[PDB]
Amino acid sequence: GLIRLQELIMAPSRYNIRLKIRQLPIDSDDSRPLLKEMKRGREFRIIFDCS
């Protein structure tokens, strides 16, 4: 997904969006710390690459 995401990563040549990046847990399914982090992050528009 990073290979097919880097286009959107460099795409703010055209636009001024703010954009961060995080990873799912690579082996575990306890993403609940990350979700706690994004709850602290006060964001409302999140990209999801997954099965």
Partner: protein, 50 residues
């Protein structure tokens, strides 16, 4: 082996040896470098995907 290739986890061979350096070590090196530089602006310059 000498160069690098991506290797997944379910990818489960046994018989291999490489000498390419691990990327996370390299990014850690650049991390402590720019932390020795203490910057707030950055700019990614690169050729391709990898």
């Amino acid at each position: 082996q000498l160069r690098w290739k991506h290797h997944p986890l379910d990818n489960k061979d046994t018989f291999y040896v490489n000498l390419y350096p691990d990327y996370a070590s390299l990014s850690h090196a650049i991390l402590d470098l720019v932390q020795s530089l203490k910057w707030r602006s950055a700019t990614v310059v690169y050729d391709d995907s990898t």
